[PDB]
Amino acid sequence: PTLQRDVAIVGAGPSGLAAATALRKAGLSVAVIEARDRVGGRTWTDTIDGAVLEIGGQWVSPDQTALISLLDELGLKTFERYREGESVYISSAGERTRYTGDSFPTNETTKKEMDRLIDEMDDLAAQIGAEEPWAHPLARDLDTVSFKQWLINQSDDAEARDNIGLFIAGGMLTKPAHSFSALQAVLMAASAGSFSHLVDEDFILDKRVIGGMQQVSIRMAEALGDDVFLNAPVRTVKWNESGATVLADGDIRVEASRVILAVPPNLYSRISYDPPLPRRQHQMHQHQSLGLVIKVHAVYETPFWREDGLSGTGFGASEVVQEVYDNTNHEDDRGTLVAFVSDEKADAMFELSAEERKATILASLARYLGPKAEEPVVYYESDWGSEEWTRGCYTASFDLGGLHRYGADSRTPVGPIHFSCSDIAAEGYGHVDGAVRMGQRTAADIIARS
Numbered sequence: 001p002t003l004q005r006d007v008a009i010v011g012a013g014p015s016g017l018a019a020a021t022a023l024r025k026a027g028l029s030v031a032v033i034e035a036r037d038r039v040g041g042r043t044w045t046d047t048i049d050g051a052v053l054e055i056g057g058q059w060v061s062p063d064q065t066a067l068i069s070l071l072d073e074l075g076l077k078t079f080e081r082y083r084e085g086e087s088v089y090i091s092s093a094g095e096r097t098r099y100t101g102d103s104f105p106t107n108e109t110t111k112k113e114m115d116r117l118i119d120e121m122d123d124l125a126a127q128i129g130a131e132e133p134w135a136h137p138l139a140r141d142l143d144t145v146s147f148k149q150w151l152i153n154q155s156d157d158a159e160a161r162d163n164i165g166l167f168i169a170g171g172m173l174t175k176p177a178h179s180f181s182a183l184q185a186v187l188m189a190a191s192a193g194s195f196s197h198l199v200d201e202d203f204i205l206d207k208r209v210i211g212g213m214q215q216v217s218i219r220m221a222e223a224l225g226d227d228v229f230l231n232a233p234v235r236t237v238k239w240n241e242s243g244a245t246v247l248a249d250g251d252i253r254v255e256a257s258r259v260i261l262a263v264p265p266n267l268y269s270r271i272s273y274d275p276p277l278p279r280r281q282h283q284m285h286q287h288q289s290l291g292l293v294i295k296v297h298a299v300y301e302t303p304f305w306r307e308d309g310l311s312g313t314g315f316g317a318s319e320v321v322q323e324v325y326d327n328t329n330h331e332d333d334r335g336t337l338v339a340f341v342s343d344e345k346a347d348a349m350f351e352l353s354a355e356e357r358k359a360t361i362l363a364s365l366a367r368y369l370g371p372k373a374e375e376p377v378v379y380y381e382s383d384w385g386s387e388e389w390t391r392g393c394y395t396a397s398f399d400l401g402g403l404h405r406y407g408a409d410s411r412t413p414v415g416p417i418h419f420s421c422s423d424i425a426a427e428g429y430g431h432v433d434g435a436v437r438m439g440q441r442t443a444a445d446i447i448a449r450s
């Protein structure tokens with residue numbers, strides 16, 4: 001059918017829904033048009049082989065105040081990731097060492113170099129900020145050198161560089177360090193409130209939502225009722241000065257004063273725009289791309305590692321699995337691990353059979369926490385790259401040199417067309433907290449003009 005609303009919202013991930021929520025609060029009418037048969041986009045709770053698993057985004061850090069606010073406003077509660085006992089570090093040389101502490105048990109040299117790099121990243125993020133990295137006088141220099149090359153420029157120590165890289169590269173951008181810029185690294189750190197925050201997993205991986213993160217979008221959408229349309233990919237946006245018409249599958253047609261495109265940048269061109277967007281959007285959008293990470297879930301009879309006095313945390317820059325954490329659900333007696341294979345290493349695992357990939361990842365888990373890890377009861381791999389309405393994970397980021405060249409244009413509305421996703425956020429960049437922020441900023445920006 002066909003309908004009028006003040007704002008048409010394309011995509012019902014946490015960013016779009018957040019916008020829809022805030023717009024309704026201000027007495028403005030919305031239609032949220034979603035491609036999938038569900039809401040929540042890159043967040044998604046589902047039962048696989050009888051195990052409740054968080055396929056997408058799931059964690060909540062203390063600096064994520066927009067989201068903490070929304071959580072409390074929607075009546076959802078949180079809980080700590082388990083953290084008692086020792087973490088496991090696996091060196092460049094493949095040596096596994098248990099440790100407690102805020103810093104990795106490397107030799108002194110690497111330890112000092114790490115600390116110098118953490119401080120140096122903290123200072124650059126404090127000076128540069130997550131709001132407009134591109135506008136800082138240091139932006140050009142920082143954004144035309146890869147994070148790889150920058151680290152080489154700063155430190156002679158292979159292992160320290162690799163370990164710093166782990167936190168940004170496989171940690172947040174899920175692209176290799178040779179493919180994004182020092183500026184982009186800085187911007188990541190600023191968005192979490194600092195690099196030290198990215199380093200301490202007790203911070204960035206603090207808490208989860210009882211009921212899973214998808215509940216955040218499900219609740220916002222339940223409150224929107226018939227104004228949320230599922231199974232409706234948006235194909236065309238006709239627009240002008242006064243407003244737009246959004247066409248979607250199942251003969252849907254929304255006429256509105258403003259549009260929010262609440263989809264990750266790499267999918268903007270999935271929609272035909274009549275007339276075509278300006279040259280600048282045409283170019284900038286090509287330079288944006290998602291990372292790749294396999295998010296691995298293994299479920300065990302008990303959380304077995306806790307008996308050996310381990311926390312379930314592992315870090316290993318040179319391992320096929322780079323991070324692992326305890327991801328035992330609230331009140332579950334079965335133990336659950338979450339592990340990550342990133343960028344080029346995810347490619348390599350995807351090049352193997354489903355069966356040979358699982359053996360290889362499980363062997364890696366085994367090198368962290370012992371051979372009981374090769375005996376899971378449920379095993380599952382997240383696969384956002386295969387999904388036509390995502391195409392990777394966790395976030396889209398500019399190619400090398402893209403951020404300073406295009407950054408300032410990335411949120412600018414084009415006539416009635418607005419843009420909101422976590423991939424272009426300031427604080428919370430790439431995280432649910434970002435999606436929520438961008439949605440709310442988009443709504444406010446729309447309110448102020450109307």
Ligand SMILES: Cc1cc2nc3c(=O)[nH]c(=O)nc-3n(C[C@H](O)[C@H](O)[C@H](O)COP(=O)(O)OP(=O)(O)OC[C@H]3O[C@@H](n4cnc5c(N)ncnc54)[C@H](O)[C@@H]3O)c2cc1C
Pocket residue numbers: 010011012013014015016033034035036039040041042043055056057058059060232233234235262263264267270271293295382384389390392393394395420421422423430431432433435
């Ligand atoms: C494996 C993985 C792990 C993650 N880990 C963390 C974490 O633990 N902590 C954290 O906070 N976040 C993390 N993230 C990232 C986080 O999930 C996202 O950044 C956040 O969900 C962004 O949401 P969004 O609203 O901006 O976009 P999305 O969630 O992608 O929403 C976009 C929506 O748009 C829809 N859509 C796209 N095109 C169209 C179209 N043409 N027509 C109609 N609908 C369309 C899609 O179907 C989707 O529902 C994780 C993400 C992944 C993938």
